[PDB]
């Protein structure tokens, strides 16, 4: 009955944007500083190790956005972080997921991507002191 997905996409984006704004306001001063350090580091990783990350994305077949494959990607990343949980690798995974979202996009409509983000962030937050130690040592 005469649907218009351009309307739908704009509304989804508009509301998501309003939510991101709210989440930003709710970030504490400590979280904001943390966010700034993570952004600088992971964008730096994006620059220097783009060929390494692009290769990972090829291995994971990120172009394939089927539910079956997005889960295979999550499980692979999760299991990788388990067998190698160094702070350095955790930061590369953040950069990696940044590359994935920039390649295929993410409106939240894809719930499996939501699980990937949540579970990986949780794993990265484990043994926090090792990660904070690595980050602050990096900013000198």
């Amino acid at each position: 009955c005469n649907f218009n997905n351009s309307i739908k996409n704009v509304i989804v984006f508009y509301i998501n944007e309003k939510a991101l704004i709210e989440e930003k306001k709710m970030l504490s001063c400590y979280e904001n500083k943390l966010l700034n350090l993570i952004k600088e580091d992971c964008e730096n990783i994006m620059l220097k190790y783009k060929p390494n990350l692009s290769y990972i994305c090829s291995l994971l077949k990120v172009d394939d956005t089927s539910e079956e494959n997005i889960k295979h990607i999550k499980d692979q990343i999760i299991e990788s972080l388990e067998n190698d949980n160094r702070p350095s690798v955790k930061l590369a995974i953040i950069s990696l997921i940044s590359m994935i979202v920039e390649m295929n996009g993410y409106k939240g409509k894809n719930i499996p991507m939501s699980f990937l983000i949540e579970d990986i962030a949780l794993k990265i937050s484990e043994n926090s002191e090792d990660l904070i130690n690595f980050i602050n040592i990096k900013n000198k």
């Binding site: 990783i45 190790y49 390494n52 990350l53 290769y55 990972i56 291995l59 994971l60 692979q76 299991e79 990788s80 067998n83 190698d84 160094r86 350095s88 690798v89 930061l91 590369a92 995974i93 690595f134 040592i137 990096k138």
Partner: peptide, 21 residues
């Protein structure tokens, strides 16, 4: 391919660790 992923991530980590110095 599971081991191939771990190898690439390990190198990235290894390089970041040394560049930490």
């Amino acid at each position: 391919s599971t081991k191939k992923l771990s190898e690439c991530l390990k190198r990235i980590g290894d390089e970041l660790d040394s560049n930490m110095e």
